[PDB]
Design an enzyme around this catalytic site. Structure first.
Site, PDB file in Angstrom:
ATOM      1  N   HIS A  84      25.694   8.985 -31.332  1.00 13.71           N
ATOM      2  CA  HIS A  84      25.634   7.738 -30.786  1.00 13.71           C
ATOM      3  C   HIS A  84      26.499   6.635 -30.384  1.00 13.71           C
ATOM      4  O   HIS A  84      26.767   5.751 -30.868  1.00 13.71           O
ATOM      5  CB  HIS A  84      24.477   7.346 -32.140  1.00 13.71           C
ATOM      6  CG  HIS A  84      22.793   7.704 -31.645  1.00 13.71           C
ATOM      7  ND1 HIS A  84      22.846   8.857 -32.163  1.00 13.71           N
ATOM      8  CD2 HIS A  84      22.033   7.369 -31.368  1.00 13.71           C
ATOM      9  CE1 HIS A  84      21.945   9.401 -32.351  1.00 13.71           C
ATOM     10  NE2 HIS A  84      21.147   8.351 -31.592  1.00 13.71           N
ATOM     11  N   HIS A  88      26.667   7.018 -24.859  1.00 18.06           N
ATOM     12  CA  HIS A  88      25.142   7.262 -24.849  1.00 18.06           C
ATOM     13  C   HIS A  88      24.504   5.910 -24.003  1.00 18.06           C
ATOM     14  O   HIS A  88      23.283   6.534 -23.351  1.00 18.06           O
ATOM     15  CB  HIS A  88      24.783   7.635 -26.151  1.00 18.06           C
ATOM     16  CG  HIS A  88      23.527   7.608 -26.661  1.00 18.06           C
ATOM     17  ND1 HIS A  88      21.945   8.252 -25.880  1.00 18.06           N
ATOM     18  CD2 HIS A  88      22.451   6.810 -27.027  1.00 18.06           C
ATOM     19  CE1 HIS A  88      20.872   7.585 -26.090  1.00 18.06           C
ATOM     20  NE2 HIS A  88      21.112   6.723 -26.363  1.00 18.06           N
ATOM     21  N   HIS A 124      20.014  -0.924 -26.684  1.00 20.31           N
ATOM     22  CA  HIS A 124      19.451  -0.003 -27.771  1.00 20.31           C
ATOM     23  C   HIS A 124      19.747   0.734 -29.234  1.00 20.31           C
ATOM     24  O   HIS A 124      19.513   0.785 -29.766  1.00 20.31           O
ATOM     25  CB  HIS A 124      18.345   0.734 -27.010  1.00 20.31           C
ATOM     26  CG  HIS A 124      19.051   2.084 -27.209  1.00 20.31           C
ATOM     27  ND1 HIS A 124      20.063   1.831 -25.756  1.00 20.31           N
ATOM     28  CD2 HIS A 124      18.480   2.978 -27.316  1.00 20.31           C
ATOM     29  CE1 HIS A 124      20.345   3.695 -25.898  1.00 20.31           C
ATOM     30  NE2 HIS A 124      19.365   3.748 -26.975  1.00 20.31           N
ATOM     31  N   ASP A 125      21.549   0.917 -29.021  1.00 23.73           N
ATOM     32  CA  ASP A 125      22.068   1.446 -30.196  1.00 23.73           C
ATOM     33  C   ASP A 125      23.210   1.035 -30.851  1.00 23.73           C
ATOM     34  O   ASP A 125      24.614   1.714 -31.634  1.00 23.73           O
ATOM     35  CB  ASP A 125      22.327   2.995 -29.540  1.00 23.73           C
ATOM     36  CG  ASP A 125      21.103   4.378 -29.649  1.00 23.73           C
ATOM     37  OD1 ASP A 125      20.668   4.285 -31.276  1.00 23.73           O
ATOM     38  OD2 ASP A 125      20.832   5.644 -29.431  1.00 23.73           O
ATOM     39  N   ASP A 236      16.448   7.466 -23.455  1.00 24.75           N
ATOM     40  CA  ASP A 236      17.010   7.433 -24.423  1.00 24.75           C
ATOM     41  C   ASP A 236      16.768   8.825 -24.388  1.00 24.75           C
ATOM     42  O   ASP A 236      17.657   8.992 -25.113  1.00 24.75           O
ATOM     43  CB  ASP A 236      15.585   6.738 -25.585  1.00 24.75           C
ATOM     44  CG  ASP A 236      16.846   7.062 -26.534  1.00 24.75           C
ATOM     45  OD1 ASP A 236      18.159   6.626 -26.689  1.00 24.75           O
ATOM     46  OD2 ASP A 236      16.042   6.127 -28.154  1.00 24.75           O
TER      47      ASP A 236
HETATM   48  C1  D07 Z   1      16.746  10.816 -30.317  1.00 24.02           C
HETATM   49  N1  D07 Z   1      17.052  11.530 -29.673  1.00 24.02           N
HETATM   50  C2  D07 Z   1      17.538  12.941 -30.031  1.00 24.02           C
HETATM   51  N2  D07 Z   1      18.075  13.882 -28.593  1.00 24.02           N
HETATM   52  C3  D07 Z   1      18.059  15.860 -29.645  1.00 24.02           C
HETATM   53 CL1  D07 Z   1      18.121  16.546 -28.071  1.00 24.02          CL
HETATM   54  N3  D07 Z   1      17.186  15.892 -30.255  1.00 24.02           N
HETATM   55  C4  D07 Z   1      16.720  15.219 -31.235  1.00 24.02           C
HETATM   56  C5  D07 Z   1      16.927  13.600 -31.239  1.00 24.02           C
HETATM   57  C6  D07 Z   1      16.221  13.044 -32.197  1.00 24.02           C
HETATM   58  N4  D07 Z   1      16.075  14.487 -33.237  1.00 24.02           N
HETATM   59  N5  D07 Z   1      16.215  15.445 -32.205  1.00 24.02           N
HETATM   60  C7  D07 Z   1      15.929  17.100 -32.771  1.00 24.02           C
HETATM   61 MG    MG Z   2      18.542   4.461 -31.575  1.00 24.34          MG
HETATM   62 ZN    ZN Z   3      19.958   5.823 -28.380  1.00 25.77          ZN
END
Ligand code: D07
Ligand code: MG
Ligand code: ZN
Length: 344
Positions: A84, A88, A124-125, A236
């Site tokens: 994050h 990203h 957004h982050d 996202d």
């Molecule tokens: C929010 N973005 C995400 N991207 C990936 Cl690769 N895995 C994720 C999320 C959220 N939970 N998991 C397991």
């Molecule tokens: Mg976020």
């Molecule tokens: Zn994000």
């Protein structure tokens, strides 16, 4: 290890000039472009070029030194956790631009709903700490005190940081806007940024799936809301629509970030979620579950609304198949000692 730095508390971006998108890369406007391949130092210039190419700087009479300042502030507004971070947000903003260039977004949403999606993607982050909403509550942070009773702690903070940037000297890109149009922007940004909470996605999937079944409407002021939610989530999770190597690298970053939270939770004497515990998490199975339960249903819905988006769903499904095929060569829980998945 869970310690993520904020760099702080412009002429070289305008004296050079705004670059045409093809000079950045001939494949820059394609779903096969990997925005993470662009050097970090070139990303601010790329944001300006995308706004110039979507004709947002001219259609809204945005002051270029102000836009240059705002972009640098938003970039500086990110910390350095493994996932994050600014790269990203930059890659998420690039996918929004790809949706504009490849799907006929104007034939589904108002121009202001698209310009807000892009600015929201950039923001957004903002100021993410490498921890989820549950950790804010557990650690009794200033952010949980402020927003936990309201829900979506981090998301409300990201929006507040975006507003703070807009209230900084020489950074208000919407300064010339009328009070009615300045307020419209703020409202769309709040809803778009709030849609990035996955808990919100679990709550609106029943409505998303039904809209896909019945079909979309362009004059309908509401339909534009479930769509903005789906499209924001699409930006996202857009790393899942790239090549296998991008998906592999993103899994490596998000789990390095999740496991650092896990270690912090253990240090506080609390048991982390299985997926954040380096001694319990089995990355291939967790990645396949996330692709099957979260990512693929989103891109399948996107395909149902835009036929030209079929290639995105196909790449997500293909990436998931690749994770099932390679799980045999991944026998350990957590990450290797070097925190790398390059061996796969
Ligand atoms: C929010 N973005 C995400 N991207 C990936 Cl690769 N895995 C994720 C999320 C959220 N939970 N998991 C397991
Ligand atoms: Mg976020
Ligand atoms: Zn994000």
């Amino acid at each position: 290890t869970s310690l993520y730095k904020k760099a702080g508390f412009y002429t070289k971006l305008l004296h050079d000039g705004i670059q045409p998108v093809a000079a950045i890369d001939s494949n820059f406007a394609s779903f096969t472009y990997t925005p993470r391949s662009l050097p970090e130092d070139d990303t601010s210039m790329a944001i300006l070029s995308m706004l110039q190419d979507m004709n947002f700087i001219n259609n809204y009479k945005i002051d270029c030194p102000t836009l240059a300042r705002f972009c640098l502030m938003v970039k500086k507004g990110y910390r350095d956790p493994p996932y994050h971070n600014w790269m990203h947000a930059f890659s998420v903003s690039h996918f929004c631009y790809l949706l504009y260039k490849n799907l006929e977004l104007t034939n589904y949403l108002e121009d202001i709903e698209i310009f807000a999606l892009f600015i929201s993607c950039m923001c957004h982050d903002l100021d993410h700490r490498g921890t989820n909403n549950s950790f804010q509550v557990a650690s009794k942070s200033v952010l949980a005190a402020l927003y936990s009773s309201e829900g979506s702690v981090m998301e409300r903070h990201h929006f507040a940081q975006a507003i703070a940037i807009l209230n900084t000297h020489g950074c208000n890109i919407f300064d010339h806007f009328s009070r009615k149009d300045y307020q419209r922007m703020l409202d769309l940004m709040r809803d778009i940024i709030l849609a990035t909470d996955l808990a919100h996605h679990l709550r609106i999937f029943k409505d998303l799936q039904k809209m896909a079944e019945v079909g979309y409407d362009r004059n309908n002021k509401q339909h534009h809301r479930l769509l903005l939610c789906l499209l924001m989530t699409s930006c996202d999770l857009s790393d899942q629509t790239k090549g296998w190597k991008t998906t592999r690298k993103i899994a490596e970053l998000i789990y390095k970030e999740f496991f650092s939270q896990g270690d912090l939770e253990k240090a506080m004497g609390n048991r982390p979620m299985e997926m954040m515990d380096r001694e319990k998490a089995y990355i291939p199975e967790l990645q396949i579950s996330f692709m099957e339960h979260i990512a693929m249903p989103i891109y399948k819905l996107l395909q149902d609304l835009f036929p030209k988006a079929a290639e995105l769903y196909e790449r997500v499904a293909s990436n998931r198949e690749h994770w099932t095929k390679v799980s045999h060569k991944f026998t350990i829980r957590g990450l290797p000692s070097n925190n790398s998945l390059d061996f796969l």
